[PDB]
């Protein structure tokens, strides 16, 4: 019996809307578990997101299941989706990001 992916720290995900002062770090987390161990990837505005096009790139951590962006700027505004998948199943969550002048 393998197990579809599930969130391991739901309580940590509750702050869905993030209104961040320009210059601060935003950290988005989607801790999951499953068998086999799920993979995580991020979308921005529905598009695969690697941070090739943002100043400073991103930190990714499969270890922490997190997306980390330092020095947020206006063009960072958007919707960030974490897709957690394994052979068995699929789960997704959205964080909303705003950046304050």
């Amino acid at each position, epitope marked *: 019996p393998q197990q579809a992916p599930y969130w391991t720290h739901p309580q940590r995900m509750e*702050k869905k*809307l993030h*209104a961040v002062p320009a210059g601060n770090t935003v950290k988005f987390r989607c801790p999951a578990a499953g068998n086999p161990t799920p993979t995580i990837r991020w979308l921005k505005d529905g598009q695969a997101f690697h941070g090739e096009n943002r100043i400073g790139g991103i930190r990714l951590r499969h270890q922490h299941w997190s997306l980390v962006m330092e020095s947020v700027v206006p063009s960072d*505004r*958007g919707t960030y989706t974490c897709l957690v998948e394994n052979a068995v199943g699929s789960i*997704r*969550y959205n964080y909303l990001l*705003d*950046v*304050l002048e």
Partner: antibody
Amino acid sequence: EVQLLESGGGLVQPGGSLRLSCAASGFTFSDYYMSWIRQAPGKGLEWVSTISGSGGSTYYADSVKGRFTISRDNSKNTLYLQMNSLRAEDTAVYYCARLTAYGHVDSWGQGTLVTVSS
Amino acid sequence: QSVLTQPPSASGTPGQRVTISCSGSSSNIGTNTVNWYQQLPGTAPKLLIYRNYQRPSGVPDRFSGSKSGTSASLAISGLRSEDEADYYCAAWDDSLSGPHVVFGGGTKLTVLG
């Protein structure tokens, strides 16, 4: 004291346009996500649209997508709902709502009634 | 109609316990926080429960929110006449279209006797 003051509702023909406004005070307006939620009389709540503090992100119910536009003027502390191609089924009381970091409403306007009828 | 499902009506006699249910899916209730609103006639909704189970200041212990899986529950114990109102559950929903807010269709609570 938080204050959300709707204006602009009224009677409109099918196909016509109408802009709702909502004037905010008692809080830093540009920090908050703001929503429009509507209720047809004697019917349930339905979410219409949300906008982010800066105005940079925009989200719409399927039934209004491509007819309504949410916007805001932060220097006037005002939220707007531009409504176009109005259909009868758009008749409702429209409410301004303030959102928290947790995605729920923590403050509502009094509502403005919009009637779409020939 | 609504993407969350509530029973249209609920009844109780004073001092009874009533529970209004709210059925959803994994993309809304399963993953996102549930909120409950109470609405009196000709007035704006009032927050009863946020982040699944928390009560705002001013909302008595008689109202308690819970959820399990894709189903949420508003339990009202010590039913009072002044509880008659419409009740709505609500949550964000992470669908394929992107995130949107979904409401239950509302439950009319009647206090009997």
